[PDB]
């Protein structure tokens, strides 16, 4: 079957997080690694792959290490021409390789025949619910037929940050939040959108959820963002 939806107790509450929400916002606000038709060139640990991807933006890195859930997953893509898309971090990003470095998890998709002829992008439906009621609906776009949930998730939150202040420097307008993916085969899974309780946000630990390199069919997958305001 699929992953059971969360119960209010299953979700992180921003009210229980006393750190700087800006460090969560940072991961999704016009922040991401993107590369097309590349192959890994090294590996730190057997479950990760390293690519030569440069920071077109601010030249902050030219080497990117992506960690996967296990060796098989890393073995699968080691010698393949792929595309990369994910949210990177620097705090506690470590690895040597024989130029700045940056880190991430999952985000790999085979490049061969996974694109649309002539710059055609695929729209994906995202419906936002605030306190159980659909408030706004929109679409995010991707250039891949089979895209990682991470890519879609990142794009959804980028949008919500700008238009719903999903994340602010200190705290958020919402108490709980989770993004749910529904596949055309009935299978569903979700991610908690709030930081773990406490006074410090561990970017590396949080992004590790994109570990599984979960992919979905962009032309048929649907997305639902469920949020709640503290009181209502």
């Amino acid at each position: 079957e699929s992953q059971p939806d969360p119960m209010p107790d299953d979700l992180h509450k921003s009210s229980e997080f006393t750190g700087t929400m800006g460090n969560m916002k940072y991961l999704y606000d016009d922040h991401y690694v993107s590369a097309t038709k590349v192959k890994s060139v090294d590996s730190f640990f057997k479950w990760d792959l390293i690519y030569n991807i440069s920071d077109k933006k601010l030249k902050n890195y030219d080497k990117v290490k992506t960690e996967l859930l296990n060796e098989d997953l890393a073995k699968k893509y080691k010698d393949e021409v792929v595309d990369v898309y994910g949210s990177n971090y620097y705090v506690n990003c470590y690895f040597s390789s024989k130029g700045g470095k940056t880190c991430m998890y999952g985000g790999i998709t085979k490049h061969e025949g996974n694109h649309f002829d002539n710059g055609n992008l695929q729209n994906v439906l995202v419906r936002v619910y605030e306190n159980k009621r659909n408030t706004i609906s929109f679409e995010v776009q991707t250039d891949k037929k089979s895209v990682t949930a991470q890519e879609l998730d990142i794009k959804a939150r980028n949008f919500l940050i700008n238009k719903k202040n999903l994340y602010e420097f200190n705290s958020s307008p919402y108490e709980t939040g989770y993004i749910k993916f529904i596949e055309n085969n009935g299978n569903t899974f979700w991610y908690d959108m709030m930081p773990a309780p406490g006074d410090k946000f561990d970017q590396s630990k949080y992004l590790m959820m994109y570990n599984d390199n979960k992919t979905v069919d962009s032309k048929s997958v649907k997305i639902e963002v469920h949020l709640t305001t503290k009181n209502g």
Partner: protein, 180 residues
């Protein structure tokens, strides 16, 4: 002297094995899980008296690899000489019939730090309740390691600790049976 606390770490190519642990008089205090990026206390209660920032092991291990690369090249790619393990099987305490106990497979004096260990109950592989430690340091710079198997003694069951290592021409089987 009376006490020694050792912080031991290593990186092995091409296996890409990395380890970071702390040792107290020969007993592991904890090591860091490089994948989950967390501290793993040898005994649960230790973790309630102290803490360790696992990210520190990850920073070190990255430096250790870079250094391994430099050294490998500096020795004109002189590979390590395989040193086969001495294997001993014992129970943690005197054995009594139907009295719960634990079989201990002691793998010692070997290098490089890579081994395949499996238990055999009457010639068949055992998986239930087995646990193991990480590679522990030795003054001679070789390694030690422990694998455990909780069991219930009987004159019917016979066990074997099957060890494989590049230093062993063939897999080594250490037999154990109730002879007390």
């Amino acid at each position: 002297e009376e006490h020694v606390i050792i912080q031991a770490e290593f990186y092995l190519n091409p296996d890409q094995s990395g380890e970071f642990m702390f040792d107290f008089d020969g007993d592991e205090i904890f090591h860091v899980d490089m994948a989950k990026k967390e501290t793993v206390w040898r005994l649960e209660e230790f973790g309630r008296f102290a803490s360790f920032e696992a990210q520190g092991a990850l920073a070190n291990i990255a430096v250790d690899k870079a250094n391994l690369e430099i050294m490998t090249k500096r020795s004109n790619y002189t590979p390590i000489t395989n040193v086969p393990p001495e294997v001993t099987v014992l129970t943690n305490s005197p054995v009594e019939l139907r009295e719960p106990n634990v079989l201990i497979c002691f793998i010692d004096k070997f290098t490089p730090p890579v081994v395949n260990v499996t238990w055999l109950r009457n010639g068949k592989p055992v998986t239930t309740g087995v646990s193991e430690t990480v590679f522990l340091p030795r003054e001679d710079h070789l390694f030690r390691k422990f694998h455990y198997l909780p069991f219930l003694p009987s004159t019917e069951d016979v066990y074997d600790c099957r060890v494989e290592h590049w230093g062993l021409d063939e897999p080594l089987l250490k037999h154990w049976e109730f002879d007390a």
